[PDB]
Design a binder for this molecule. Sequence first.
Ligand code: CA
Lengths: 378, 371
Amino acid sequence: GKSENTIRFLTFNVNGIRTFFHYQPFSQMNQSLRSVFDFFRADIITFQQLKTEKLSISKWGRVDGFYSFISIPQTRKGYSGVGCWIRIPEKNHPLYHALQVVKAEEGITGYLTIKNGKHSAISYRNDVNQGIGGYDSLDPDLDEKSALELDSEGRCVMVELACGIVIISVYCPANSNSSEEGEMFRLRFLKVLLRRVRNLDKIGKKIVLMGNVNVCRDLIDSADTLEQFSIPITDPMGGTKLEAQYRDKAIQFIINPDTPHRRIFNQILADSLLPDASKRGILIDTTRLIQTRNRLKMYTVWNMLKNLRPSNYGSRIDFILVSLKLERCIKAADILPDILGSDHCPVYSDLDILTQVPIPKFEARYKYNLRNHNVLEM
Amino acid sequence: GKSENTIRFLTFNVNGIRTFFHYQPFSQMNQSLRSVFDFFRADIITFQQLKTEKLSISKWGRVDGFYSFISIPQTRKGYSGVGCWIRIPEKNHPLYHALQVVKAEEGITGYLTIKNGKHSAISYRNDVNQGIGGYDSLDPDLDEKSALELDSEGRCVMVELACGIVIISVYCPANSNSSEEGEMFRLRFLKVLLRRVRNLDKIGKKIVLMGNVNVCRDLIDSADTLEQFSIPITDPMGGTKLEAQYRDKAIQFIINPDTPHRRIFNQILADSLLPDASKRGILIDTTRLIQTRNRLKMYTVWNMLKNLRPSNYGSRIDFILVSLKLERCIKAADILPDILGSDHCPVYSDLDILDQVPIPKFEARYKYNLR
DNA sequence: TCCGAAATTTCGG
DNA sequence: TCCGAAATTTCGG
Ligand SMILES: [Ca+2]
């Protein structure tokens, strides 16, 4: 179970929020996200790949006892989409002032807009009281046209708490078709994201970056590559010995020039296998911290398989990454591969952290005007 | 060489039956389908994508010694079109009573009509002595309008023999423009067709499904996808080694939710790569059975505009599928990539059957009113 | 006579 | 990467 006064972060690539509610035990919960969140005993939850539409936000955006922040594509339906939910504790709770949401933002670039008046619209970069900040040079040749296109697929939601913690929930592109246009989009997204994180860290923000990064960081987290190199997994807790016996191949997995995204992602992890990780990384893999590097077969995705978790198959591309200043707060971190309903499994981590501000305009009830989703609309 | 009890099935996406007669050796046959069928020594033949018109049926629908069953669009000329031809054996032949055509049908839904009199027509679903059967719930919400729309492009011809064999000749939609409405039409056509196959199989018919399915079943039948995954082909007979090293991509190819037509086609294949194919599928890929899964680059279509036929870079979308009840009959099966005349190549399979009547009204002489 | 539940087969990933 | 969810077939008062 979870401790009494810790915040449980939960990430889950549901691969269709409507479809995941068709599996036990969630099929018994009448499509109630509140029942799901109480089932996992979670307080800050992010769901990636919602595959939803604006009409359905009247259901996923109103959760009793929670704040809802949801980002979907502007026009394309049933594609991508990220949601983040912050539990509202009671006034007599010690984490009441900590879990106060002071800001909320959509995207990584800051060029996305929020309703400002009748026909007016202002982006997050121009409003310092609503934008979280850290937009200082995310890319060398980044104009508004490319930044809006980079944020056009509903892949990021940002939430800032009163205790100075910025939660960044991402569903990074995967480039599943192996195209040149898709690979450049993937690399540009990752570089802008990690740069945005580095900017917020210099300002002094405690950063929790979690979600589906679609990047494998170490060789031991790739069932396909371990079979390609004929490396047998005999000891389920023999990860350190495997990385010592195959030190050369473990490093080649990261710095492989055919896969620069693996190198870019490792360059921000302080606990990376690269020797100079502690001199350049600022984020810590919470799951690898608690489970250690000995645990093998610690996979969070089994592509296209929602009903079974086969052996010798799968990867780990779902993470909960925290700033160095939050390493001393990690009390628990694991995965839940027995949960069915998606080709991904949930990942959770418990952190011990221990005037009024209006609700941010990006809250789902305001961003999507849920008070008007009535009969003619539905 | 073939025995006396051997039946040669042949399928060919001619892509314009008039244009296919321009190439060797068919240009010296004076546009005689009888000469073409004798050239292949074939007994049951289906040509897809005829691109003909009602005026020209008087030639393609009157083949000496053959029954002719041709389906074309109602109004659109030079588009789609399917034809099936059954050889009429002599009375001194052991397969004379087996090759008797007892029924014939147009389309997959049965909602199409047939001539009955003067200003009065009846569909195949209402007449039991003309319809083949198996119409029981082919789709959840299928009305008369959407079904006739599904059978409006002349893409299917069904023929039932006296020995219980039902030959289904199809030219399934391809969705070339890659539109949302076209993908739904393709998916609904493929679902209704395969459901009609399972219904006729439960009734007890020995089904032979052949034609242009426009769907790749396995990764090894797609030069495009093999190059996308950066899978080189060195040994032309190393299909088992390729599928073993790339087992993940081979299975993800079948169950990929982004390409559901590949999943739907696989569920009816008894020889599908999935673990439950033996209990779940009812059809056998004759070409894959005889050529085995080792033969790579067994393509039946190539992009002519990109000149990919010389290098044998293409796909296999043309099949001859048979019921499990006909499994022990398959004596030979191969593709014929050396035959010119189209951007596809023919496919054949030999079945040993080893086992008068009024001609159906859908025959070409009755359906299109021939003198 | 509608109703539903167990048993069974088929489906999608 | 076989497995749970969906559909259907069966059974009976
Ligand atoms: Ca709780």
